[PDB]
Every structure is written in C-alpha cells, then in structure tokens.
Write an enzyme that holds these catalytic residues in place. Structure first.
Site, short mmCIF file in Angstrom:
data_model
loop_
_atom_site.label_atom_id
_atom_site.label_comp_id
_atom_site.label_asym_id
_atom_site.label_seq_id
_atom_site.Cartn_x
_atom_site.Cartn_y
_atom_site.Cartn_z
CG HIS A 199 20.94 -20.02 18.86
ND1 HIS A 199 20.80 -20.02 20.23
CD2 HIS A 199 21.89 -19.11 18.52
CE1 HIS A 199 21.70 -19.16 20.69
NE2 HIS A 199 22.37 -18.57 19.70
CG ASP B 131 18.95 -22.52 21.65
OD1 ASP B 131 19.15 -21.31 21.83
OD2 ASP B 131 19.57 -23.21 20.80
N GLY C 104 27.72 -14.32 21.10
CA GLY C 104 29.02 -15.00 21.08
C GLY C 104 29.17 -15.92 22.29
CB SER D 226 24.82 -18.59 21.92
OG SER D 226 24.01 -17.43 21.94
C1 LIG Z 1 22.46 -12.64 18.53
O1 LIG Z 1 22.72 -12.06 19.82
C2 LIG Z 1 22.53 -12.83 20.98
C3 LIG Z 1 22.39 -14.25 21.03
C4 LIG Z 1 22.20 -14.89 22.25
C5 LIG Z 1 22.17 -14.17 23.45
C6 LIG Z 1 22.01 -14.86 24.70
C7 LIG Z 1 21.91 -14.15 25.86
C8 LIG Z 1 21.98 -12.70 25.84
C9 LIG Z 1 21.82 -11.96 27.14
N1 LIG Z 1 21.25 -10.69 27.15
N2 LIG Z 1 22.24 -12.58 28.16
C10 LIG Z 1 22.19 -12.03 24.66
C11 LIG Z 1 22.28 -12.75 23.43
C12 LIG Z 1 22.48 -12.09 22.16
O2 LIG Z 1 22.67 -10.74 22.13
C13 LIG Z 1 21.53 -9.96 21.72
C14 LIG Z 1 22.14 -8.59 21.34
C15 LIG Z 1 23.08 -8.69 20.15
BR1 LIG Z 1 24.37 -7.14 20.18
#
Ligand SMILES: COc1ccc2ccc(C(=N)N)cc2c1OCCCBr
Length: 246
Positions: A46, A97, A196, A198
C-alpha cells in the site's frame, strides 16, 4: 507511533526509512521497512501501489532521524520494487499487504552490516507467538492522529498480540480481519502504530530469537479503543518471500 519512546537506530538496526522523490526535487517520507538480507528490504504494498516507479524511492539504513544524516547511515536506490500480485484494499482491510525492495548503493552494493545496520530474522512457518506476547514496533509515523507532521526522532513502542477470534469480534474488526493478518495493541489503548508507520516491523522475541513477526498494515484510527493495529502475518508469506528473493 502514538506514545511509546523516542529511540535511535542502534536499538532497531533492521529498520529501513523509505522516502519518495517528487518532480521538482522535494523528498518526503513514505513508510518504514525491515532489512531481511543485505540486498532486501521488506515493507507493505500500500506504501507504493499509487506510485509504482522504483526510480522515485530512496531507502536509508542506520538512519535515526527524519532530516539528519545519522553517522554510519547508508543510502540506497531501489533496483527492484516487487509488489504482491494479489494486493487489494477494502474500506479498512488491506490484503497481501507486502512488498520487497531490492536495494543498491550508487556503487552497486547491498547493505554492509554494522553496529547500526543489521538484518532481522524471518519467522518459521506455523510458529507465531501466542496471543498476549509482547512485541515491539518502530517508526517515524504520527505521534497523534490529529498531527500532519511526523516526529523528527525515530520512535518505538511495545504492544501485545491479540488472537484472531478476539480481533474478529463485532466491536473490533468482525470478518474484515483474516487469518493472514495479526492484531496487536495496547490493552489500555494508549500506545499504537499510526499513519507513517506502515511497512515497518512488528518484532517479537520467540524462543529467545528476535523475529519479524509482522509488517504494519492497517487500522481504524490510531490508539482507538477496540481498534488494534493490523499487521501482515509474515509466516504466511514465507513461500512468496523465498520465491521473490531468489
Ligand atoms: C492512513 O493511515 C494509516 C495507515 C496505516 C495504519 C496502520 C496501523 C494503524 C494502527 N491503528 N495501528 C493505523 C494506520 C493509519 O492510521 C489511520 C488513521 C490516520 Br490519522
């Protein structure tokens, strides 16, 4: 990373910092990754699917800060960007992913292991840690969901693995989370990976060995109640990893 602690690359030496070059020359951070062998960095599809040009990427090893050239760091280009053929994204769930980045310095060399640059062992098949095992995560991801900037210093935290049965509960992710995915979170919902982070590692010590158990993939919000971090289960992908690194 929400909560946790600031750290340095010598404590997470397999950690890879991946950036993208834009037209005009600006460089922005993209995702984390992990060094699995000198030539190979493992991350998440992704992170790259919308910009699948290997030439645009910059990979650093031994780098502790977002905008500082850490002493002992090494800079690489991507010789081969391998994205999983069956990757797809649902509203929340990201499938297959996983990505591989073959790294090459300007001189054509792979990573040189040092005190700040080391590989992370891959897991064994059908041998992941039991639910409740404490594991660590690393990344340059957001410190708060409301932030738009990433921390300047590398962060780490510790989270606990959650069983597939618990993660499939209706207030959690229901049938959206699969057996090819691993959930992990803080029982108090105060610390977590975030946007960030990821592509970055979920490292578990299993039978005395530090292992790349997971890859940060997806989650609803960050450090949200009943919303664990969801990680690609690396042990499922051992045939794909072996086939694409050969
Ligand atoms: C595009 O945002 C991502 C992308 C990958 C993620 C991967 C994991 C987590 C998590 N809650 N551990 C949040 C993630 C995430 O945050 C979601 C909230 C965005 Br402020």
């Amino acid at each position: 990373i929400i909560g946790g602690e600031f750290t340095t690359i010598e404590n997470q030496p397999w950690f890879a910092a991946i950036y993208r070059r834009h037209r005009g020359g600006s460089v922005t951070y993209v995702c984390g990754g992990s060094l699995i062998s000198p030539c190979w960095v493992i991350s998440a599809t992704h992170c790259f699917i919308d910009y699948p040009k290997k030439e645009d990427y910059i990979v650093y090893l031994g780098r502790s800060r977002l905008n500082s050239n850490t002493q002992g760091e090494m800079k690489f280009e991507v010789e081969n960007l391998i994205l999983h053929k069956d990757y797809s994204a649902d509203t929340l769930a990201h499938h297959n992913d996983i990505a591989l980045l073959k790294i090459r310095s300007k001189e054509g060399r792979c990573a040189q292991p040092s005190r700040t640059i080391q590989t992370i062992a891959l897991p064994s098949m059908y041998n992941d840690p039991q639910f409740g095992t404490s594991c660590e995560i690393t990344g340059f991801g957001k410190e708060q969901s409301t932030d738009y900037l990433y921390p300047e210093q590398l962060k780490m935290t510790v989270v606990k693995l959650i069983s597939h049965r618990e993660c499939q509960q209706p207030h959690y992710y229901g049938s959206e989370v699969t057996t090819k995915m691993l959930c992990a979170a803080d029982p108090q919902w105060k610390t977590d990976s975030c946007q960030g982070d990821s592509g970055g590692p979920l490292v578990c010590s299993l039978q005395g060995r530090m292992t790349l158990t997971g890859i940060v993939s997806w989650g609803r919000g960050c450090a949200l109640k009943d919303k664990p971090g969801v990680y690609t289960r690396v042990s499922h992908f051992l045939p794909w990893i072996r086939s694409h690194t050969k």
